[PDB]
Amino acid sequence: VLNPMWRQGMFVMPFMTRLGITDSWGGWSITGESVSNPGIWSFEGVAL
Amino acid sequence: MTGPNPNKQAVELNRTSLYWGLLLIFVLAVLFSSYFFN
Amino acid sequence: MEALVYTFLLIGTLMVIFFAVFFRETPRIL
Amino acid sequence: MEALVYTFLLIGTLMVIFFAVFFRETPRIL
Amino acid sequence: VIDYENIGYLGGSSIVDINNANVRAYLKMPGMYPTVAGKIVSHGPYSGVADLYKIPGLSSAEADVIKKYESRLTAKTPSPDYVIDRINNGLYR
Amino acid sequence: KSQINELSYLQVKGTGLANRCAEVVGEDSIKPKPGAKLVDMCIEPKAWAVEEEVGKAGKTEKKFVNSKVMTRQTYTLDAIEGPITVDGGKITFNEKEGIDYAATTVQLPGGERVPFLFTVKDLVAKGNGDTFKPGFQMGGDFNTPSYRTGLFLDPKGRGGTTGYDMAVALPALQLGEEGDAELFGENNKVFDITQGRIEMEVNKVNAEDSEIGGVFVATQLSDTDMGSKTPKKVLTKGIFYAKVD
Amino acid sequence: LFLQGFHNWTLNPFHMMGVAGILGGALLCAIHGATVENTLFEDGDAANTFRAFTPTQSEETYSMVTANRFWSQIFGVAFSNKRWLHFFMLFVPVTGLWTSSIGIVGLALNLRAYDFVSQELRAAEDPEFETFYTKNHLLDEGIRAWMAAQDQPHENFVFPEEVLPRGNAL
Amino acid sequence: EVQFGAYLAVLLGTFLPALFLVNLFIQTEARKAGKAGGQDSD
Amino acid sequence: EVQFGAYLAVLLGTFLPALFLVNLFIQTEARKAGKAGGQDSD
Amino acid sequence: VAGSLLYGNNIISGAVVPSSNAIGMHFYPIWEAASIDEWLYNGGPYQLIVLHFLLG
Amino acid sequence: LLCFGFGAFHVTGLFGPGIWVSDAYGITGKVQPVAPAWGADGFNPFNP
Amino acid sequence: SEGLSESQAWSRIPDKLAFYDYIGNNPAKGGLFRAGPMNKGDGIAEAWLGHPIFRDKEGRELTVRRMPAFFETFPVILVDKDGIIRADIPFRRAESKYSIEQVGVTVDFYGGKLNGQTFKDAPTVKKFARKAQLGEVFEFDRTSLESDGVFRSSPRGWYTYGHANFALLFFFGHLWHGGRTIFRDVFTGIGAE
């Protein structure tokens, strides 16, 4: 809410989220929805 | 490996161009350092 | 500490100017 | 932030090992 | 705790805290180790040394060995990090 | 359960059955005697939730966030016994002995690991009614001891009842009149005892086996690491079993 | 063990360069010894290949081309120069003895690689930050307290048992 | 207090492009020395 | 917290001696190309 | 007014500051200044540089 | 084929996650499939 | 001897003399990669706190055994004039018998900035026993250089590091260039005849 991705200087992170990547392997999403298993296309799996 | 490439050329940088580029990089470093250090 | 960088850049620029004048490629005919 | 330097040095070392193996000067006779 | 007062009454001062000392502190008093020392250590907080005679499962023989060293027993505030380590504090000679 | 007692040790080991509670069959009633005593109370958590501020759709309410266990199958309490005291109206249970604590570590979204001593130590649990029924509700407070004892040494060799009392790798911090007062909270290891609250609820009673069993819900605080971090509230749910005698 | 406990000599990068030169020298001894012995030329009819060498012969007794071919496909990289190979067998252990001599001159003045201060500062204010680094410092504080009364007897170190650092139950 | 990453930005932004041009000039003179054919060609 | 001058010591201690050796290798190959006499000598 | 790099300036903000307004158009060489610190306080170096630059 | 497939499958959520849409004030946003707007309001650039 | 008290005698000690008697000024207390001035370690020295005199309940003077230069860490131990252990700060607290709370050690300061001041509660006596094993106790300013808390070496220690390592490396250069002189006729190789 008060520290979103655009307050933290994230540049490529909004372009991943624009097209569908919300979850990470660390269990969080940017929507706040806690996630069990995002699979391959998390933020980390897209970067790898 | 295929054959030896016939497009291979030599590269030059004479002493004038070295002095012009050394001056350009040092002056751009002089100019932009105060802004990078902020 | 950044004045060390500022001094080194200015003195380094003047050393390039020294070598550009006294170690120049001499223009030669033929 | 220094883990960025640690990663770059290790990955940079492995890139030298890649070029030393696959871009080596081939030993040639005569 | 950095500075725990009543640190002498644990094992070294030859006056033993009843609420906080390990069972090895009663090895200096003959007759107490192991069965009388085991009953002091296994039961709950005591306001004074007179509450040692209210331990369920004492004898008159186990009471008379307590009255020998009631000069040497004392009751302080039970510090919980010493109360849990009264049977076995991880010290072995 | 009678089924688990039919097996060998070699048939159970490795399988994960030894971390499970017995299931009770039937809806009956047991009226406890004056000398009655629960004996082998198993308490198995099946869900774990840690309280944390979350950013759901536009606001920042407090939510119990579901967390994953990383200490594999060591979390179930078992062999809990203690007398069942019959009051005037109500029936109460005071646990005394048994494996009434299990160190569990859960991981939050973000990688945050939350260790906590899941316990029912010194539980005095008040019930509603006088017999164990399929609607009976027992609940009460318990004491959560500190996750580390005073004998625990930290990575720098400091503990509560043993260890250094100074950051011994920074000897020049012991200088001046202020000393290492900025490092007091890390050098002062404090044994803290907090309170938890469990609410059991019987739904299955076997009268021929004198066995009860139902669900529970418990909340407690996590590890403070000898008073160095602020503890988090851990909500847990699951199944219990007991035998009544 | 005195120089581990009191100086943290394994952590010193000059001992580390010494270990690399000595283990690298024993490696170079074993590889070059076995490569020559397994790329030998058939110069006799005996299965005992030691008899088929003359100390005054001019031919090479082993195939350098086959030895270079073997290690280029096994390891990716092989020696092609016998002169550079044998200089390298000189260079590696001697550099290891010279680099480790530099760091032991530093230990003479107690200019030791003892602590990473950023990990010591973090572990001071965060009492769960544990690495294998901080575990080695607790081993050194055990060495320096338990051996110092016996190893420096002129100093008359009297440590009571209450000040000796122990873990639990040991 | 100045930004600490600017020491890297200025000094690597100076040295690495300067040493690239020193590299280009030196190989230009070495290529001329090799083609000249005497005592510096080898 | 780490020492901030170590970023300069590591990165200039890597790049400047590495670019010196890249400089020496490139002028070695350019000197061989100039002496070879064809299309790369100029 | 600070003007030099050792008193906290950078290349852009740094300057040789002009002479004092109390001096005005008066000639201020070093030998008319009773100490070099008084000459440096009153903007003496500006008059030395400017007059040698314009002659040069 | 890549422009059509991105529009038909990824963005409309036929075989895709959709894109990020939000309300008019950026409070509640999510990735969801987006139906195409074939009228003149498809050239409204704030219409997803 | 000339009719002054303990407090007047210790106030005559110059702070420059007390500053030399402190282990942070030892050149053998630094580290190879602890970079910078000695002020970067403990801070900039500001004032001498005075000389602590430790006494237990019967009244004889105890002295804290000073840290030797080998030791990064050292146990805090109070001995009397005979070297017999009278008090310490125990690692294990359970069967401890020479703790400062048992023996009842008090500390009196003399000279310095704490000149007439007595501390009798064992928390602050233990704080002063920890700094008394580093020699004379000084008040430092550890916020100007943002000091980390680990001792650095002096320029005396740094000179000896560089020039004894340079001299060792230069011994190899003597062997190399000397062998290159005597053997000059065979440094392209030897003849096969």
Ligand code: CLA
């Ligand atoms: C970029 C090219 C393009 C394409 C492929 C379409 C396609 C479509 N338009 Mg759209 N339209 C366009 C541009 C385009 N339009 C532009 C620039 C405007 C002005 C902002 C409109 C305004 C518009 C309206 C108001 C409506 C459509 C509708 C439609 C759909 C019905 C086809 C029709 O002929 O109905 C004819 C109905 C009309 C009202 C006439 C408008 C249709 C325009 C003129 C489409 C012609 C563009 C043509 C295909 C481009 C090819 C040029 C060629 C020389 C290369 C069809 C999906 C209709 C629809 O189905 O909405 C859901 C509809 O109501 N269009």
Ligand code: CLA
């Ligand atoms: C992986 C394991 C390993 C390896 C390979 C090494 C390797 C080394 N260690 Mg290290 N070490 C290690 C682990 C290891 N270490 C560990 C875990 C510790 C505990 C922290 C140490 C503690 C340690 C210390 C304290 C020292 C070393 C030193 C060394 C160096 C030894 C130099 C040498 O050859 O001395 C052998 C001796 C010589 C080469 C001197 C000359 C010998 C002459 C020629 C002998 C002539 C004898 C003559 C023939 C007479 C014989 C006959 C007589 C018996 C009658 C070498 C680089 C030493 C060093 O760094 O020196 C610079 C050193 O002082 N190590």
Ligand code: CLA
């Ligand atoms: C090219 C040589 C040169 C010249 C022209 C100057 C000029 C100046 N210097 Mg600089 N200086 C120089 C080199 C020079 N400098 C060098 C090499 C050094 C290092 C040693 C210095 C160190 C230095 C310092 C530290 C200072 C100066 C200063 C000055 C200024 C005043 C000095 C003064 O009063 O002199 C005396 C001048 C004369 C006596 C004038 C002689 C001219 C004659 C008389 C011609 C007149 C002809 C006449 C009208 C004809 C009439 C004939 C008719 C009647 C028949 C003046 C602008 C001062 C300054 O900058 O003030 C702000 C100052 O502080 N100089």
Ligand code: CLA
């Ligand atoms: C044309 C442009 C385009 C772009 C940029 C995207 C982008 C995306 N798509 Mg979409 N999509 C598209 C068109 C496009 N799509 C089309 C045409 C279809 C129909 C086939 C789809 C159907 C579709 C589905 C069903 C899904 C996506 C998803 C995604 C997202 C994650 C996939 C990814 O990043 O892989 C990036 C790929 C590379 C960088 C190439 C990798 C190449 C290496 C060599 C292979 C890697 C090996 C293996 C696959 C991964 C190793 C695992 C390890 C890293 C752990 C990403 C935002 C997914 C999503 O949003 O999940 C949250 C998702 O489920 N897309």
Ligand code: CLA
């Ligand atoms: C005889 C040589 C010598 C000696 C004894 C000193 C001594 C000193 N210097 Mg000086 N200095 C010197 C030469 C010397 N200097 C030179 C040649 C320069 C120009 C580069 C400097 C520039 C300099 C500055 C800017 C400063 C000092 C400072 C100091 C003081 C603190 C030392 C310290 O903390 O080091 C820290 C420890 C080290 C540097 C370790 C030494 C290197 C080890 C042995 C590794 C060897 C290199 C390694 C193999 C290569 C790296 C690999 C690469 C690929 C990354 C100390 C009095 C400081 C001071 O207090 O000034 C007020 C300070 O700020 N020096």
Ligand SMILES: CC(C)=CCC/C(C)=C\CC/C(C)=C/CC/C(C)=C/CC/C(C)=C/CC/C(C)=C/CC/C(C)=C/CC/C(C)=C/CC/C(C)=C/CC1=CC(=O)C(C)=C(C)C1=O
């Ligand atoms: C990627 C990740 C995550 C990494 C993390 C890993 C990590 C924790 C650390 C790794 C970093 C690391 C490398 C640290 C080591 C640092 C260190 C101690 C450096 C030492 C530096 C140094 C200057 C030391 C001085 C001593 C020195 C010179 C040693 C060099 C040792 C050395 C390279 C030895 C040679 C080893 C080698 C494999 C030789 C094989 C030779 C070989 C191919 C023979 C082939 C061969 C044999 C024949 O006989 C013939 C006939 C022919 C024909 C022939 O071909």
Ligand SMILES: CCCCCCCCCCCCCCCC(=O)OC[C@H](COP(=O)(O)OC[C@@H](O)CO)OC(=O)CCCCCCCCCCCCCCC
């Ligand atoms: C991660 C990798 C990052 C890569 C970055 C590194 C590459 C960057 C360096 C390349 C730049 C080289 C420029 C060389 C310069 C140089 O080579 O000049 C000479 C060159 C003319 O070359 P000729 O055609 O004469 O060819 C001679 C050849 O030998 C050149 O190769 O001119 C140009 O290149 C175009 C004009 C640029 C003129 C340069 C003048 C710059 C103005 C100076 C401003 C300073 C004074 C201002 C004071 C106010």
Ligand SMILES: CCCCCCCCCCCCCCCC(=O)OC[C@H](COP(=O)(O)OC[C@@H](O)CO)OC(=O)CCCCCCCCCCCCCCC
């Ligand atoms: C899994 C199977 C594939 C094997 C994996 C490949 C790994 C191969 C490693 C090659 C490194 C090349 C060294 C470059 C140097 C290079 O390419 O040399 C190539 C060189 C060829 O020498 P020549 O005899 O051709 O040289 C004659 C003259 O040119 C002398 O200058 O061979 C040797 O001198 C080196 C042999 C020892 C090789 C030592 C390897 C060191 C091990 C790696 C240490 C770094 C590990 C760092 C980890 C972070």
Ligand SMILES: [Fe+2]
């Ligand atoms: Fe050989």
